[PDB]
Amino acid sequence: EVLFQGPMEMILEEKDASDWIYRGEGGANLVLAYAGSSPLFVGKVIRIQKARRKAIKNSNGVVSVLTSDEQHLWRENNELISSPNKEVLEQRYVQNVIIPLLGPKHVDAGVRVSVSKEFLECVDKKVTKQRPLWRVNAANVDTSHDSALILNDHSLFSQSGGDCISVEIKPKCGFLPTSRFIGKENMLKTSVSRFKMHQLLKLEYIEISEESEYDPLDLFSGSKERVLEAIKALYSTPQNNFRVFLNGSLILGGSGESTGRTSPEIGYAFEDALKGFIQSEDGHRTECFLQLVSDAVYGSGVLDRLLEIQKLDKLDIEGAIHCYYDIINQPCPICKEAELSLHALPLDESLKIVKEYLIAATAKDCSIMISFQSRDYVSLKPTNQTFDYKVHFIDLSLKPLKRMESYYKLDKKIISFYNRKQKAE
């Protein structure tokens, strides 16, 4: 019998920085994979929030997690609107808003760990050279936070077997709006997907090398032909929607950003990297892997549950924005003759519309990670091997209420540019 220390919350300090290595990042978070051997952390990633190089302050000048409007918008959950920091808040947003709608089979609020400012600084220093320049220009780790999130590394299975092939799909929005509030001049928004139209604008700003062949309407069609077609397009033009890891190591896609089209060189390189994982011929392992990914995604039904959250955007930003201006008690700058009748709604109805809009916005920007190891399972019809797979949602971030205004401007920019390109053509 031996005396053990009492329970104490874990704190990653400056020393521990050498144990984490760059895995990736999106617009809001940096993700590091644990390299050490502590059981606490093997098979985990650490997700560290970035700061855009304007704080939120309460009426006392104190720095705050939610504005008054946000704390009212999300008031239905007491713990949520009481969160002392952005890691708590995101953790409770997932547990108490997303998990009820999505279910917990493929969703994990994660676990908080304490971090010292020096840990955050050394981490930021350590990885800078592996981040994309433009990501570095836009944001670094927010060293003023005292927590981070520990998640499972969906790029491994470990707890058996050997090689693990994992895939990330960022599916974006898989339906077309039908709102009464889309004017006639914008009606192409009802026949052409936001993702398609945004492609054109992305090209104008040199944010992508080429238009994607991917169509979310195929991926969310519930038709296995279209799902596979979508997987094939994602393979051809990954951009920032498709990644593939071998034992946690990028073998297709971009590191923290979009990548350009798959060239025969990049395809040959990939075809080889599947050697031994996909028992198959020589120029055929890719064809089988794409089939594997299509069958796993389709068989899991995760896309259908996700699509129903994305459809909580019932009125489109062009209707939702009017409820926003009522929510924040500002005269509506959109109305200048308009369907307006939104503005006659009771407060709680305007609140529910915007709240549901932001939840939908979470569902439009989340990712899906599918993990594979040779033998839930999928069996290939040609090769006849069985593969174990797990599916996991990542990146269910709560969206800031003030971004409604940014949502509406971007939408205005997108349909307006897309209309012009239809005209001049």
Ligand X SMILES: O=P(O)(O)O[C@@H]1[C@@H](OP(=O)(O)O)[C@H](OP(=O)(O)O)[C@H](O)[C@H](OP(=O)(O)O)[C@H]1OP(=O)(O)O
Site residues for ligand ADP per CB under 6 A: 23-29, 31, 45, 47, 151-155, 168, 243, 367, 369, 394-395, 397
Output 28 or 297, the one with its CB closest to Mg ion: 28
Which stretch in 18-26, 278-286, 287-295, 407-415 sits in contact with Mg ion by CB under 5 A? 18-26
Structure tokens at 424: 């001049």
Site membership for Mg ion, residue 395 (CB under 5 A): yes
Which partner, Zn ion, ligand ADP, ligand X, none, binds residue 240 by CB below 5 to 8 Å per kind?
A: ligand X
- Residue 11 carries which side chain, given as an amino acid letter? I
Answer for which of 365, 378, 393, 408 binds ligand X (CB under 6 A) is: 365
Contact 199, 208 (CB under 8 A): yes
Q: Tell me how far, at minimum, the Cβ of 285 lies from ligand ADP, in Å.
A: 23
CA distance 275 to 278: 6
Q: Tell me how far, at minimum, the Cβ of 29 lies from ligand X, in Å.
A: 7
Residue 105 three-state SS: coil
**Paired strand residues for 31:** 24, 47
Site membership for Mg ion, residue 238 (CB under 5 A): no
The dihedrals phi and psi of 315, each to the nearest 5 degrees, come to -110, 0
Output 24 or 319, the one with its CB closest to ligand ADP: 24
DSSP 10-61: -EE-GGGGGGEEEEEE-SSEEEEEE-S--TTTTTEEEEEEEEE----B-TTS
Site membership for ligand X, residue 399 (CB under 6 A): yes
Which partner, ligand X, Mg ion, ligand ADP, none, binds residue 224 by CB below 5 to 8 Å per kind?
A: none
Which stretch in 25-33, 38-46, 216-224, 349-357 sits in contact with ligand X by CB under 6 A? 25-33
How far from the centroid of its chain's Cα atoms is residue 236's Cα? 21
Which stretch in 15-23, 212-220, 345-353, 387-395 sits in contact with Mg ion by CB under 5 A? 387-395
Structure tokens at 298: 């389709």
Contact 112, 52 (CB under 8 A): no
HSE (side-chain half, CA atoms, 13 Å) at 335:
19
Q: Tell me how far, at minimum, the Cβ of 328 lies from ligand X, in Å.
A: 18
Residue 118 three-state SS: helix
Site membership for ligand X, residue 240 (CB under 6 A): yes
Q: Tell me how far, at minimum, the Cβ of 392 lies from ligand ADP, in Å.
A: 7
Q: Which residues bind ligand X (CB under 6 A)?
A: 26-28, 172, 198, 240, 361, 365, 399, 403
